[PDB]
Symmetry: none
Subunit: 137 residues, 2 copies
Amino acid sequence: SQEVMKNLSLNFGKALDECKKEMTLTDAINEDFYNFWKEGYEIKNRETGCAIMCLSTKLNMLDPEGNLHHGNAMEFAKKHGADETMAQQLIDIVHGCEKSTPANDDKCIWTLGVATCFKAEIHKLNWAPSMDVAVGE
Amino acid sequence: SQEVMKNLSLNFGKALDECKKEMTLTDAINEDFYNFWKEGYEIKNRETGCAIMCLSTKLNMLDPEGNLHHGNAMEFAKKHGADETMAQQLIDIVHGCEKSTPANDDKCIWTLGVATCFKAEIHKLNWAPSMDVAVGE
Ligand SMILES: CCC/C=C\C=C\CCCCCCCCCO
Ligand SMILES: CCC/C=C\C=C\CCCCCCCCCO
């Protein structure tokens, strides 16, 4: 649901300021987060991949290979309002996008690739929200 | 708590190198200690069963019948940050896993079975650490 996706999106972005400082990321990521759920907007900055990776790492959502930790993603999803089925469906998109995008040793570009694939799949479910406030803000 | 399980996992395995040097053991067990908590991973080596016994025995967590000593297991769990409810929950998993695992006269193998049952239940509670997955150092 769009509603849940808004709540997940705002809770996922809350540490962005903390990641921006800590990783010295430029303001190039600002347009990607402001536009994250705008259908047809292409996210293409490498640093946004870095930012997303930092955000996941901070929510304990990553394993030591860099793939999603299913336990903590499920717990995150549930904490912000998804039921079991919606939570599993989101895990399955992320997991599907990890297997469907080309392996890349540059973790920031690979995380970007996962995130773009995830965004597209959420648009296809008609779950992308209309945000009044940007992710990260 | 995953933070607590991290603290107990680091500290339970601190004497592994001492364990390895004293006994028998191939470096084949390192794969099980380094990857213990990963969601896909199954602990697999027989000497890891033997390592866990030496670590338990050295921490004074094993009774005369070979079973967990609940009093000292409580002390170890609390020392490393478990409150009483989580401590008791860990004891009850161990104790349940001592019952549900098939009897065996190889103690190394039986301990491997109790440890794999313990791991599975910590995954079910979402208490396995997501990025810091090792037992020991
Ligand atoms: C698992 C639930 C995700 C929820 C909300 C996401 C909002 C925008 C961020 C999407 C990126 C998720 C993919 C990340 C895995 C690798 O960091
Ligand atoms: C009850 C406390 C155990 C704490 C931490 C364990 C980390 C690795 C898990 C190994 C399985 C435990 C097996 C029982 C042996 C007694 O310590």
